[PDB]
Amino acid sequence: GSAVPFHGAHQAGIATPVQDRLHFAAFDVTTEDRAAFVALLKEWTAAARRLTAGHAVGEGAYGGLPEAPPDDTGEALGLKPSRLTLTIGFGPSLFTRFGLADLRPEALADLPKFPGDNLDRARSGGDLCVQACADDPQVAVHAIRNLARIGFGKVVVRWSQLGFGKTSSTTPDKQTPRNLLGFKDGTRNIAGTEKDRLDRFVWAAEKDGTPWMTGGSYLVARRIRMHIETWDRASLQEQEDVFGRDKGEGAPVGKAKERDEPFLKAMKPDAHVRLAHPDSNGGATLLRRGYSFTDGTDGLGRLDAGLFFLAYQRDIRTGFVPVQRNLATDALNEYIQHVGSAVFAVPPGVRDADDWWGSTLF
Amino acid sequence: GSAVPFHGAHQAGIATPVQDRLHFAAFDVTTEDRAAFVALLKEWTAAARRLTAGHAVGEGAYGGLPEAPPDDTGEALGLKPSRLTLTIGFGPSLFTRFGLADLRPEALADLPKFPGDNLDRARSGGDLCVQACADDPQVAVHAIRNLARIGFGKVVVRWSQLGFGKTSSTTPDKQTPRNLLGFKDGTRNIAGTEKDRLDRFVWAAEKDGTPWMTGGSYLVARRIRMHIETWDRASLQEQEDVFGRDKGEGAPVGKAKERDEPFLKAMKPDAHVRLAHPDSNGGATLLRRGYSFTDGTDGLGRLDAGLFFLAYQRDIRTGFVPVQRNLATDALNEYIQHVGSAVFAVPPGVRDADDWWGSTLFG
Ligand code: HEM
Ligand code: HEM
Numbered sequence: 001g002s003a004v005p006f007h008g009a010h011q012a013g014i015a016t017p018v019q020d021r022l023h024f025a026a027f028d029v030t031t032e033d034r035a036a037f038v039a040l041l042k043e044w045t046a047a048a049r050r051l052t053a054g055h056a057v058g059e060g061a062y063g064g065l066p067e068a069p070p071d072d073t074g075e076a077l078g079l080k081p082s083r084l085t086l087t088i089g090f091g092p093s094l095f096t097r098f099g100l101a102d103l104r105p106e107a108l109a110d111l112p113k114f115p116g117d118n119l120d121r122a123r124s125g126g127d128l129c130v131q132a133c134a135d136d137p138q139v140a141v142h143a144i145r146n147l148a149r150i151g152f153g154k155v156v157v158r159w160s161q162l163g164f165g166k167t168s169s170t171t172p173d174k175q176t177p178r179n180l181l182g183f184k185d186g187t188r189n190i191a192g193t194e195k196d197r198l199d200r201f202v203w204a205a206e207k208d209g210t211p212w213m214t215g216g217s218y219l220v221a222r223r224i225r226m227h228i229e230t231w232d233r234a235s236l237q238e239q240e241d242v243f244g245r246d247k248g249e250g251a252p253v254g255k256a257k258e259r260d261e262p263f264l265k266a267m268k269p270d271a272h273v274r275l276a277h278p279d280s281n282g283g284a285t286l287l288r289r290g291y292s293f294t295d296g297t298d299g300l301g302r303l304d305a306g307l308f309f310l311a312y313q314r315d316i317r318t319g320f321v322p323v324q325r326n327l328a329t330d331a332l333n334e335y336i337q338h339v340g341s342a343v344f345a346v347p348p349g350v351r352d353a354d355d356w357w358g359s360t361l362f
Numbered sequence: 363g364s365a366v367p368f369h370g371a372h373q374a375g376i377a378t379p380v381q382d383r384l385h386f387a388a389f390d391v392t393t394e395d396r397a398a399f400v401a402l403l404k405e406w407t408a409a410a411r412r413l414t415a416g417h418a419v420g421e422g423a424y425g426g427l428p429e430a431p432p433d434d435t436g437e438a439l440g441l442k443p444s445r446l447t448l449t450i451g452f453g454p455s456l457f458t459r460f461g462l463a464d465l466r467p468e469a470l471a472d473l474p475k476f477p478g479d480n481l482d483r484a485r486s487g488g489d490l491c492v493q494a495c496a497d498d499p500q501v502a503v504h505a506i507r508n509l510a511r512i513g514f515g516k517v518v519v520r521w522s523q524l525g526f527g528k529t530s531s532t533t534p535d536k537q538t539p540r541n542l543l544g545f546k547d548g549t550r551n552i553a554g555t556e557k558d559r560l561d562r563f564v565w566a567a568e569k570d571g572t573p574w575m576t577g578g579s580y581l582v583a584r585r586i587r588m589h590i591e592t593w594d595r596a597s598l599q600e601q602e603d604v605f606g607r608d609k610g611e612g613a614p615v616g617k618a619k620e621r622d623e624p625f626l627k628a629m630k631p632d633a634h635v636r637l638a639h640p641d642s643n644g645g646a647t648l649l650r651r652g653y654s655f656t657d658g659t660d661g662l663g664r665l666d667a668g669l670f671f672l673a674y675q676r677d678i679r680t681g682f683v684p685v686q687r688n689l690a691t692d693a694l695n696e697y698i699q700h701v702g703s704a705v706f707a708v709p710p711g712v713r714d715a716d717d718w719w720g721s722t723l724f725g
Contacts (some may be wrong), residue, residue, distance in 0.1 A: 025659075061544065062610040066599035073594050074544025074609060082531045122661075136529040141542070141656050145665060149594055157663040162656060165500045175440060180503075182423060182436025212725060230512055232435060235626035237428035245434055248424035294503060294524065295657065299484070301390075301518030303507060 001080035001135070004051060005051045008349040009215050010203065012286065013085030014312050017156045017171045019285040020134040022163030022172065022291040023140040025148070026091075026126030026342060027155040032099040038362050040154050044088075044147055045356040051143045054081035057150070073149070075142050078193070082136040086143060087342030089129045089219050089356050097127075103361060105210040107218055107315040108345045115328055116337060117203045123159040123223060123340040131219075131310075137162075159340075161223065161308050162229040163291025164239065167270070168310075176258065180292050180305045181231060181335070183243055184250035187258055187278075190287045200283045201319070202312050212360040215348035220320045222309040223340030227327060229302055231335050242331040244271035307336075365443040368414045371713040372565065372578050375447030376651070376674055377554040379622045381495040384525035384653040385502035386670065387510070388453075388488025388704060389517040396460040400724050402516050405705040406450075407718040410510055413505045417565040419512070435511065438504040444500055448509075449493040450719050451581050451706030456489045463722060467572040469580055470707045471679040476497035477690050478699065485521045485585060485702040493581075493672075497530060523585065523704070525653025526669045531642070538612065538620065542654050543593055543665050543697070544614035545605055549620055550639075563647045563681070564674050577710035582682045585655075585702030586673040591664055594696045604693040606633035640686055646684045649674040668698070678705060 004012050020234045031037055047057045058071030095104040130147060148157055167179040169186030176184040190197050199205075204213045240246055244253055244267035252262040252273070260294070267274040278285045292308045298304045313319025327333070347358055366374050392397055409419045451710055457466040492509060493500040502519050503524075510519055524614075528539045535554025541547040547632040552559050566575040593601070606629035614624035614635070640647045651674060655666040675681025689695070709720055 019597070062598060062608070064598065067597050069595055070609075075540050075542050077540060077544070077610075078533075078537060081533055082529070082555040110572075136418075136532060137526045137531070137656070138468075138540075138654070140666075141667070145590065145594075148665075149591075157659050162658060164503070165498075178437050178439060180437050180507075181437070182432075228507075233431055234634050234640075235429050236424065236426065236432050239432075246424070248439070274588075292500075296522050297519050298555070301520075303510060303519055303522060305507075 001082055003053055003081040004083050004085050005193050006049055007352055010349045011087050011130055013133055016085055018166045018168050019083050020135045021137045021140050023132045023144050025144050025160045026129045026158045028158045029155055031126045031154045039360045040151055042356045043150055048086045048211055052084050057146050076139055082134045082139045084134040084139050089346045091126045091128055091344050094127045105213050105345055109316045117226050118337055118339050119341050120339055125342055126158045137163035154281035159212055163293055165292045168289045201314055202287050217312045218316050218322055219344040219346050220311045221342045222338050224309055225306045225337045225339050227335045228305050241268050255312040261290050270329050272330050272332045275326050275330050281322050281326055286319050306357045363445055366445050366447050368411055372711045373449050373494055375449035377560055381445045382497045382527055383499040383502055383528050385506050385579050387492050387495045387506050388520045389490040390520045391489045391517055393516045402513055403720045404718045405512055408446045419508050428716055435508055438501055441498055441501055444496040444498040444501040446496040451491045451708040453489050453706050467707055469574050471678045474684055478695055480701055481703050482701055488520045488706050491706050501621050521671050525655045527653055559686050563676055565651050579674045579708045580678050581706040581708050582673045583704045586671055587668040587699050587701050589697050591668055603630055606635040632691045632693045634692050637688050637692050643684050643688055648681050665713045
């Protein structure tokens with residue numbers, strides 16, 4: 001139930017241990033006034049300091065003037081911080097406004113089309129995002145609701161995604177969670193303690209060519225539907241062959257333990273792990289941080305189910321793009337479909353109490 | 363606690379402690395064959411015994427024949443029982459099948475149309491329900507996913523709702539939860555400790571007229587959307603006047619503490635608590651066991667959130683119906699809309715290892 005520190009060289013919610021719940025919102029900007037937008041970033045930063053410490057925003061949730069609406073909507077009263085993190089990003093579309101055109105980073109690349117894509121335009125893109133993660137769903141909803149309320153008239157919610165359970169790990173010392181296909185997901189990631197690998201593969205550097213992004217990262221989001229009817233009639237051997245790991249322990253094929261190193265040549269040539277592994281991709285490595293979802297039924301008698309895939313990396317061109325290209329022949333493609341997509345530049349950390357989200361850009 | 367016993371005179375998940383998460387599913391039946399349906403109820407009961415004890419269904423999630431599909435889909439491996447309960451109920455539409463029309467209980471009454479209803483037919487009704495409650499949502503989802511798979515060919519999923527209450531790891535057991543309007547919700551309710559009040563207001567008795575339902579209960583489900591953005595623009599005074607309790611402490615107006623008994627005359631005439639109280643409804647009293655929901659945002663950018671309301675009672679005609687009828691002029695109506703509805707007869711408990719869901723009805 002403890003708090004995660006809000007200030008630092010980097011934003012929290014990336015290398016941080018993965019929390020149980022997600023509420024992700026993408027927003028579009030409705031104001032043309034640069035100064036008004038800056039004022040919103042400052043007000044949102046102030047609110048974030050309160051929320052991540054388990055305090056109400058502004059003057060509180062009750063005990064003000066009877067004839068005014070409360071500053072805080074009140075549904076998190078009496079709850080602990082619950083490891084809430086709030087992570088902001090800026091989409092490519094933002095840079096067509098406020099005179100920002102020449103400051104768009106090269107590393108913030110538009111994704112190509114991928115075979116099998118079926119992207120809903122309404123649940124794709126966005127001028128900016130807020131990733132709220134916490135162990136308590138009510139704490140996460142409260143944060144997004146209050147940020148949206150504060151921004152009324154300057155931003156609107158484009159689309160949102162809730163994740164009921166995590167399917168990722170930045171803590172290899174703890175149990176790896178399972179996705180809705182029944183397999184462990186997160187064994188070979190990047191850990192929060194691996195400072196050298198984070199500098200190499202996740203954090204942007206000054207020399208990369210965009211000074212305001214130093215200490216930030218780049219985010220790819222992919223909404224992925226799972227064909228669970230089709231999966232659930234596959235044999236055990238078919239399921240295991242698709243991944244290259246066994247289902248029970250999650251060990252590489254032939255080996256006894258989850259964390260034994262994969263021997264790729266023992267896997268089928270189209271196995272997911274074999275195609276996705278850094279050694280198959282010129283060393284390309286990602287920080288995966290996704291969550292499972294279910295949004296009701298499909299109207300055809302079945303549960304809906306999916307995975308909201310999130311990856312962080314130092315440059316989209318050298319991270320997600322080469323890996324996803326190599327997945328063109330993946331055995332897993334028979335059972336999944338990508339139906340939503342977005343990319344964001346995740347700025348550096350809020351250094352101290354005088355700093356604000358986006359200060360290096362603006 | 364870790365696990366809740368599956369067997370008893372009553373089904374678990376009604377009077378047993380309230381768990382942090384919900385997955386509620388309504389099913390429609392596709393077979394006309396009574397024998398095939400009974401076989402399914404037996405298979406489902408066997409699965410439920412395994413799920414509620416934290417075990418995999420059938421021969422397990424791995425380690426069987428490589429060329430066969432696993433019996434269990436595997437996504438709850440390594441998790442705890444998480445206080446899972448599985449509660450089954452039968453809708454009015456089930457009784458048009460299998461020659462059951464004369465065994466429909468009179469207490470399983472069709473609901474009238476209420477003012478302001480805007481019911482989505484696709485998220486209403488159903489032949490059957492399973493209420494899965496647990497502290498971990500993946501445990502609840504796994505249960506529904508595997509029941510649906512076992513039943514494939516005989517039942518389909520009509521509609522499904524996820525919900526959340528408190529998170530028990532971080533929040534004390536005696537603290538009343540708040541709903542998404544920011545008010546404490548559950549202060550004056552029937553508690554599972556109140557054996558006599560359960561006998562008077564919740565459990566069906568033999569003399570009530572339907573012998574197979576003795577020790578069962580009747581369930582009403584309502585999916586109630588809140589107009590979040592409108593509510594959040596209301597003044598503090600307006601919000602408190604809507605309920606008749608204050609927002610910070612949740613005390614009745616003119617009182618100091620949450621659990622102080624209300625004085626109805628100090629509240630506005632159309633305040634929610636005043637209209638819903640038993641003294642305003644001839645003594646009618648309900649067990650509320652509902653969960654908050656947040657599903658996402660709609661096409662206009664608004665939050666799709668609310669209360670998935672669940673009420674158990676001895677008779678729908680003397681529980682939910684009179685109380686909801688009295689809310690015709692509720693001040694809360696400005697901020698909510700009922701968008702889904704269903705009613706179910708929840709049979710008595712599974713007595714022992716040889717019993718099965720629905721045995722008193724089917725024989
Ligand atoms: C529904 C979609 C997906 C499922 C169910 C899935 C499942 C898995 C599983 C079970 C593992 C093995 C355990 C582990 O090391 O984490 C794995 C590994 C991996 N996946 Fe996926 N995955 C999916 C989509 C993706 C996508 C879209 C990407 C990147 C474009 C990706 C990249 C990886 C990587 C990099 C690994 C680690 C390989 C290694 O270094 O050993 N996955 N995935
Ligand atoms: C979104 C919908 C609703 C909200 C936000 C809501 C909220 C509340 C709140 C805050 C209380 C006071 C604290 C407490 O005793 O629990 C309350 C009490 C109550 N509500 Fe509602 N409620 C809703 C719908 C309903 C419906 C549909 C019914 C019944 C048909 C109902 C029946 C009651 C009852 C019986 C009480 C207890 C009154 C007493 O004995 O003091 N509520 N509700």
